[PDB]
Design an enzyme around this catalytic site. Structure first.
Site, PDB file in Angstrom:
ATOM      1  N   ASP A  45       0.856  -1.186   0.000  1.00 24.12           N
ATOM      2  CA  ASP A  45       0.000   0.000   0.000  1.00 24.12           C
ATOM      3  C   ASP A  45       0.890   1.233   0.000  1.00 24.12           C
ATOM      4  OD1 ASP A  45      -1.782  -2.118   0.531  1.00 24.12           O
ATOM      5  OD2 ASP A  45      -2.308  -1.321   2.505  1.00 24.12           O
ATOM      6  N   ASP A  58     -14.747 -11.375   0.863  1.00 23.15           N
ATOM      7  CA  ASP A  58     -14.387 -11.649   2.268  1.00 23.15           C
ATOM      8  C   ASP A  58     -15.455 -12.532   2.898  1.00 23.15           C
ATOM      9  OD1 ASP A  58     -12.511  -9.756   1.571  1.00 23.15           O
ATOM     10  OD2 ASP A  58     -13.062  -8.306   3.096  1.00 23.15           O
TER      11      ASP A  58
END
Length: 223
Positions: free
Chosen positions: A9, A125
């Site tokens: 990130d 998820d």
């Protein structure tokens, strides 16, 4: 096949691309430039490159960051953060990303057009809820009431090229991938599955592939 994927990130800080940890909250002080190389040299096989500047904005992918990284690595780059429109996948692919991670969805034309090697990745998820695998959104905080079984099927039907399957149950534990969930999902979908959530030792990757994962994500055992 046996691809190890590393999550990176990053964000602009004083005109520099800096690597962030902890959900893009901690400035590691390491340059994106340096980490991308170090990661490749370390043995990563793919990069999930998330732009913290774009992550959830719909404004499109961080094509600047993508172009910045492309020269620096041979690895397949999956772009992440900013998608809001189908063209953005084209926009990211033009910039040099080998794959793009679709925005949180709470595709059949692009899939056909891609003729190969380039894909749209969809994040799913899941979590155990009364011995049932449920899809959750909102960093695993919100049950959607939809079974994992049903959603994986839907996602593939709707033309995703790959599934990023995160186990909320294992994510953050360092206790290993959710091989049970991987195995549950594997016969349900013909798509490559990137397993995610749980890595804590090199041996954990082996288990995920064995469970049916095509690739295994780690944001932890590197950053």
């Amino acid at each position: 096949m046996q691809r190890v994927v590393v999550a990176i990130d990053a964000k602009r800080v004083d005109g520099e691309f800096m690597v962030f940890t902890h959900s893009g909250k901690k400035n590691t002080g390491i340059l994106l430039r340096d980490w991308v190389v170090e990661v490749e040299k370390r043995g990563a096989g793919e990069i999930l490159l998330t732009s913290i500047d774009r992550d959830g904005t719909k404004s499109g992918y961080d094509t600047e960051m993508i172009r910045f990284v492309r020269p620096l690595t041979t690895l397949p780059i999956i772009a992440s953060g900013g998608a809001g429109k189908m063209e953005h996948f084209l926009e990211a692919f033009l910039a040099g990303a080998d794959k793009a991670l679709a925005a949180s969805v709470f595709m059949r034309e692009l899939k056909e057009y891609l003729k190969s090697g380039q894909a749209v990745v969809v994040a799913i998820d899941a979590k155990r809820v009364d011995g049932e695998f449920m899809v959750f959104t909102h960093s695993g905080k919100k049950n959607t009431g939809i079974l994992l079984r049903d959603w994986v099927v839907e996602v593939e039907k709707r033309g995703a090229g790959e599934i990023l399957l995160t186990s909320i149950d294992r994510d953050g534990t360092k206790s290993g991938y959710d091989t049970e969930m991987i195995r549950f999902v594997r016969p349900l979908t013909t798509l490559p599955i990137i397993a995610s959530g749980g890595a804590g030792k090199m041996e954990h990757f082996l288990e995920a592939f064995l469970a049916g994962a095509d690739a295994a994500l780690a944001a932890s055992v590197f950053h």
